[PDB]
Design an enzyme around this catalytic site. Structure first.
Site, PDB file in Angstrom:
ATOM      1  CD  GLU B 188    -116.865 -59.464  21.054  1.00 54.41           C
ATOM      2  OE1 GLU B 188    -118.001 -59.987  20.962  1.00 54.41           O
ATOM      3  OE2 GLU B 188    -116.697 -58.265  21.368  1.00 54.41           O
ATOM      4  CE  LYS B 230    -118.126 -57.592  17.803  1.00 55.48           C
ATOM      5  NZ  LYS B 230    -119.325 -57.464  18.706  1.00 55.48           N
TER       6      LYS B 230
END
EC number: 4.1.2.13
Lengths: 349, 349, 349, 349
Positions: B188, B230
């Site tokens: 992420e 992500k």
């Protein structure tokens, strides 16, 4: 700020549209860009003197083949040929145009040893490249080619970091210069088969190289939508007694590509790299049995499209038709392979 | 030699199979891994004291929702919740298991300013991470999450090179440590919406960041087949009066991903990043109208799955059913969006 | 393995010995390598037509100055001049040899815009460079020069990463090619003064650039013992109303160099970069009041050695002696500055 | 913008002044920061149980040596010792202060294998480091130490790129965090002697490693004026039958340092790395016969200051004075070596 300036949307569209035309389904590239010394070898193997007239005859033989454009989307030319007429007086590019084949131009100036490496090679040609691209565009070329070379040698740590860094940097500079002059660049980082290394070794090296390359293309603001990759397939080394199965070669090649190549790139056109004509077809066909892929997997073959053709011709003019028949057979085979529909001829993490 | 050692084929298979399960068609991730201080804010917005019992009640409310597993493939947990029982005495992981939802664990230790940057952030947590992963695996987690943060500020040259380098390096180390302990890592790199920058600015920065990230993942021998990304969607900055159209956001997000993300990666699960629940659904749906894609485009939503849920609950226990009904509505919407079949609710180079 | 092969000890010794000769105490470099278009400007400022005969006259005027070798260790030539005879028929290199001045040769082919940058420049010239070096060596040159250019523009994020990467890569390739052909390479990463930036800005940028450069020199196996650096001094931008004090310029220049330049490098020969003749002397003198330094701090001046000389000559042949007198005055001043003994003429972390 | 923010001039001055105090002429560092498990080995070799009382006795024995501060500028402590009292009840730091010895603190949390490398090691400890530095400062520490480890193995391509990248990144992060909390960081990239490699191999690897390190220190905005380097000397591998001459070791060590280390760094304090006490002295002395150097070349010795001391003590309390006498003999020897005035005891490109 500090980021790349916006590319011309008009230029970008042209590059992207021509790149997709080159990477057309059921089609691929005829690599006929042998330099004077490289073609000499080709002609040597069939006992033909390397005169300008023999080269003009052979290139005309290739490009004047009736219906070639059905399987060949583009043809890579050496500069000589780009400005050359067939023995009958027809410009080579006009032959290509008649079949709807896009002309492409080899733009590198060959190889030079990186100082203090073990004969590792930098590709030269950036000087004047931009100016050459403009002329070439005007001459009818719509894509370009630049060959970089790397070797595997575990004992000598080849390819070294300097090798990879140089290859990547040169390819990126070239790519960006080409796109600036409205030419689709073919990015060719060829990892030579030289050695007795395993296919899994080839796969590791291919991954490292392609990762470095595509990072560099990004750093230089290269439009992937308007470029093509011309990589080695992933194979055993050429000194290996056992040539890998077509299944293996297919698996590891696709794997290596999917692990490193962003899918905005429209096409991967493999070099044949010493493979037999039939292996080159069967290996590509196997990959496209594994489809659908994020990008077109196709061919940019020199030797694997010409080997039999040259041997059918033998320098004998009367064998022209026969030779042309042979070329079509192999163009059809590889076109069919592109679609994974080739019949054949005469998960590991 | 000098290349990465071969990964365990047994470990690799598990990671890859669980990664594909998480990136399942019509499904996505419920991000319920709010730390103690982050959940406090969430509860603050509905006037609820941040006690362990309220948190246990809320998490139980989420995971005990009947039929949730139809749209939710995995749920990201904070460590507390992983070892927590519902107010009725049922372990949180047992709730997840009952719905066939894969438990995942947030493993980073939050953010710390990089010295001599303008408040740019490094993500901490590598120390002991490997040992934590083993425990977490035993507790039932099969994937992990690590949040890095970058900011856009053209005037201040944000994100700086040090920022990008740090983010990339930390994500790669984390990813490799996770895979070594049989956890699928969620990578992420969130580019915050902070600022009045244009969507095209966001796109440029996103590309640069993702390019650096995936080069680093490669350098650290991270198995992309067994990982998930992500990322932020590509949007205008949060101080922009005009929120971009769903079409624009879809175009530039996919473009940015296809330009940088190798297709061996099974899934991209977007963070919602402050977007309304409905935008988060409609934006994802728009991307999947553009399919088929080389990887699954789906969601890993916290706020965009919980906003209405929290406001339906209000800390009132009797509103549990209603709140659960709201969660299902949004899980269904985003599942349908994943397939590009969401109806709606209440080329630039 | 994978490291650089051993350099020739015989070649290494020559490079190192000539580098130290060039960086001799009380001496520096006369930069007279103005290309045809650059010299045109110089001649324009004194109303002289740029004919081959005027250029031959002027270069002869410079190199035939009696006693010049007392203060000038080497002279950088443009290719024309290297193969040129004075109007009296004496080869230019023979003039240099008579004074014991080492001939050096500019080997870059000038600048070209990096695609999709805001007019940021790559230096061209690697193609054929190795072959040119051999010829140049045979012609009597024992060192070479390659000018790269960077600009500061905070608003536009200049110099960009691509700019720095390109400059560094080109300098390293050039350096290594030169040493392979027994030429000491002068590494010139010039940060232009263009702009209204502060001296502290210049210092930061200079540090970043030099750090990248010397990392690249290392990666390409460049022998620092047999090379020289030709950097900008650290100054305010040219649009600044207040020219920094000589003390400031001295402090920040030395600081920047000591923070980035390994001490195996024998010499730093500053470009004058638009500075007045007197500032160029006084600034260098100030640095060498701060000695002893880990490397020789000296000069490689073009404009700051020739400005008055050109204006004394005015294209008038009879003014030759006067012009030569002026050159000696400035060569003496800068030689004395090299030793920190110039009288003058007409810690921050 | 995008560059590092200005460091605090007040903090910078402290770091720089303390760094120069540590790198004082005729003085060096006593490395007594053996962790619990490392000291256990030391005690094992003289048959002493590793109790807290024995460790308190031994450290008190070291730091309570009369006149030690004449040759020892600083002492590196393990956290235990920093908060420890001698058996007589005197705080360890008070012992150091009485001799004017600056206390320093080991701050890394040891080593962990990089996944998918052949047992190559990352150094852990960044988590909470900043907070630890503050406490340590308050406890009286004014400098810190962080040990990274690399191995040479040509057959396995060690050190790999991942190894070097990790080491460099960790050292830089640590360095910058330390300076932010007013601690001079000792940068220790130790290349282990393990193997039968030649000294010229060690030299190549040392150069590559240090080049990467100092590039990283620059990228992270580390103030070199307020830092110290603790590198391996350049030697044959430990499995080599012929230990290189002191002349050779001196030549290649200095060469490697001058080729990579910017001269703004005040001091290089060598680790002894398994060398005998006498070699460690004689090798350092030889380097300083080659002076004057751009930076102080001195010592940060653990084993090479303690080996005989431990064996004189034998765990026997009555042997305390004798042991202390031995320590002084070796501190004097290395102090004298620092100045190139050690008498002895009982150009290649």
């Amino acid at each position: 700020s500090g980021y790349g300036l916006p590319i011309s949307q008009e230029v970008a569209k042209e590059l992207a549209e021509n790149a997709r035309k080159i990477a057309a389904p059921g089609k691929g590239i005829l690599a006929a860009d042998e330099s004077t010394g490289t073609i000499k070898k080709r002609f040597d193997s069939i006992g033909v003197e390397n005169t300008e007239a023999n080269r003009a005859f052979y290139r005309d033989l290739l490009f004047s083949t009736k219906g070639l454009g059905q399987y060949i989307s583009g043809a890579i030319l050496f500069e000589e040929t780009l400005y050359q007429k067939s023995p009958s007086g027809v410009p080579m590019v006009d032959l290509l145009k008649a079949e709807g084949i896009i002309p492409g131009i080899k733009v590198d100036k060959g190889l030079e040893t990186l100082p203090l490496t073990d004969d590792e090679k930098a590709t030269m040609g950036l000087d004047g490249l931009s100016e050459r691209c403009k002329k070439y565009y005007e001459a009818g070329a719509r894509f370009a080619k630049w060959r970089a070379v790397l070797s595997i040698d575990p004992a000598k740590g080849k390819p070294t970091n300097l090798s990879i860094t140089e290859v990547a940097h040169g390819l990126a500079r070239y790519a960006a210069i080409c796109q600036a002059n409205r030419l689709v660049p073919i990015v060719e980082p060829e990892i030579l088969t030289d050695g007795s290394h395993d296919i899994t070794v080839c796969a590791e090296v291919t991954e490292r190289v392609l990762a470095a390359v595509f990072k560099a293309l990004n750093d230089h603001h290269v439009l992937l939508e308007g470029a093509l990759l011309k990589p080695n397939m992933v194979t055993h080394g050429s000194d290996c007694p056992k040539p890998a199965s077509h299944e293996e070669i297919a698996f590891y090649t696709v794997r290596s590509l999917k692990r490193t190549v962003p899918p905005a790139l429209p096409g991967v056109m493999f070099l044949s790299g010493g493979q037999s004509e039939e292996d080159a077809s069967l290996n590509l066909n196997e990959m496209n049995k594994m489809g659908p892929h994020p990008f077109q997997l196709s061919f940019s073959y020199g030797r694997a499209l010409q080997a039999s053709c040259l041997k059918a011709w033998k320098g004998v003019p009367e064998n022209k038709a026969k030779a042309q028949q042979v070329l079509m057979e192999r163009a059809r085979a590889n076109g069919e392979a592109q679609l994974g529909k080739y019949g054949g001829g005469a998960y590991v993490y």
